[PDB]
Amino acid sequence: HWGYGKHNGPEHWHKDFPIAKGERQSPVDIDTHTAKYDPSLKPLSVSYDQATSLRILNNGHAFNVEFDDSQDKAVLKGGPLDGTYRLIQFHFHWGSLDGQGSEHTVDKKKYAAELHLVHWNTKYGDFGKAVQQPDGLAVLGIFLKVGSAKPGLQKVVDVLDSIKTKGKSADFTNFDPRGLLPESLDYWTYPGSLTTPPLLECVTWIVLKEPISVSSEQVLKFRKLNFNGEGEPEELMVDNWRPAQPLKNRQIKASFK
Ligand SMILES: CC(=O)OC[C@H]1O[C@@H](O[C@H]2[C@H](OC(C)=O)[C@@H](OC(C)=O)[C@H](S(N)(=O)=O)O[C@@H]2COC(C)=O)[C@H](OC(C)=O)[C@@H](OC(C)=O)[C@H]1OC(C)=O
Ligand SMILES: [Zn+2]
């Protein structure tokens, strides 16, 4: 189906998902000198104290750490958000080289990787209904740069060997997502879409200004994963990022000056 290769990559997605050329697609380049500081933006509230992780799965495009979202255990509120959004999963997008990998860019600068913590608006009952709404999801995006190791990320790095190929999953309970957050919660926000097919335009993007640092050793293990399934020719899971899309009729707001 769709992928990140030359014959099934981002350039081809519009054929099966025409919304790929839509009015509010993601990611986008964040021009820091065009973003407007919005003093009306309420404080961002990340409540991950009761977060309940369940499993880690290699889905052939990236790996997802899933959470129990039957209750308001881990939620995102405040900021440009109205209501409560429950955390359902997080995953990353990374490159084959340290100079690329992130989906959003800042003044055209590409980071080594990007973490996406996905949340859905509880007013819609379930994730499936939420993705069909303009304000159905809220995704917290965090850039990763290569530097010092990130303690909170090692638990994830340690289990990647058990889900090397597509379809593989492993138990992943008691993981605290709070360990992946930078010190500052300053952010940029704009209305966008999922960055992978079906590319639904149901996302309120909240991209943090401050990146987190990960070690070269940690990123290297990400690059050892496989897009292919067990018993098939090896295709390293790298460069699973969509490039920046036209901003069009949208404004990016900043929570800071
Ligand atoms: C289109 C549809 O019917 O439902 C929407 C889809 O939601 C997908 O979940 C994420 C996706 O997680 C993945 C791919 O595991 C997420 O991260 C990716 C693709 O790497 C992207 S992203 N980059 O914008 O954060 O968004 C997708 C939308 O859901 C979000 C943001 O929470 C589901 O899993 C996928 C695509 O793998 C996907 O499941 C499919 C397709 O079978 C689909 O959900 C449904 C109803 O199946
Ligand atoms: Zn993503």
UniProtKB/Swiss-Prot annotation:
Keywords in alphabetical order: Acetylation, Cell membrane, Cytoplasm, Disease variant, Lyase, Membrane, Metal-binding, Osteopetrosis, Phosphoprotein, Zinc
Impact noted for substituting T195 to D/E: Strongly reduced activity, but enhanced zinc affinity
Result after altering H116 to D/N/Q: Reduced activity
Site positions for Involved in the binding of some activators, including histamine and L-histidine: Q89
Effect on the protein of changing N59H: Reduced proton transfer
Organismal lineage: Eukaryota, Metazoa, Chordata, Craniata, Vertebrata
EC code(s) of this entry: 4.2.1.1, 4.2.1.69
Subcellular location: Cytoplasm; Cell membrane
SUPFAM superfamilies in alphabetical order: Carbonic anhydrase
One term of GO molecular function: arylesterase activity
Other information: Target of drugs used in treatments against glaucoma disorder and breast cancer.
Consequence the record notes for mutating N59L: Reduced activity
Pfam family, one: Carb_anhydrase
Mutagenesis or variant effect for L194A: Reduced CO(2) hydrase activity
Keyword match Lyase: yes
The species this protein was found in: Homo sapiens (Human)
Recorded consequence of changing K15E: In Jogjakarta
Disorder this protein is connected to according to its UniProt record: Osteopetrosis, autosomal recessive 3: A rare genetic disease characterized by abnormally dense bone, due to defective resorption of immature bone. Osteopetrosis occurs in two forms: a severe autosomal recessive form occurring in utero, infancy, or childhood, and a benign autosomal dominant form occurring in adolescence or adulthood. Recessive osteopetrosis commonly manifests in early infancy with macrocephaly, feeding difficulties, evolving blindness and deafness, bone marrow failure, severe anemia, and hepatosplenomegaly.
Name this polypeptide is given: Carbonic anhydrase 2
Record note on what altering N59A does: Reduced activity
Transmembrane segments: none
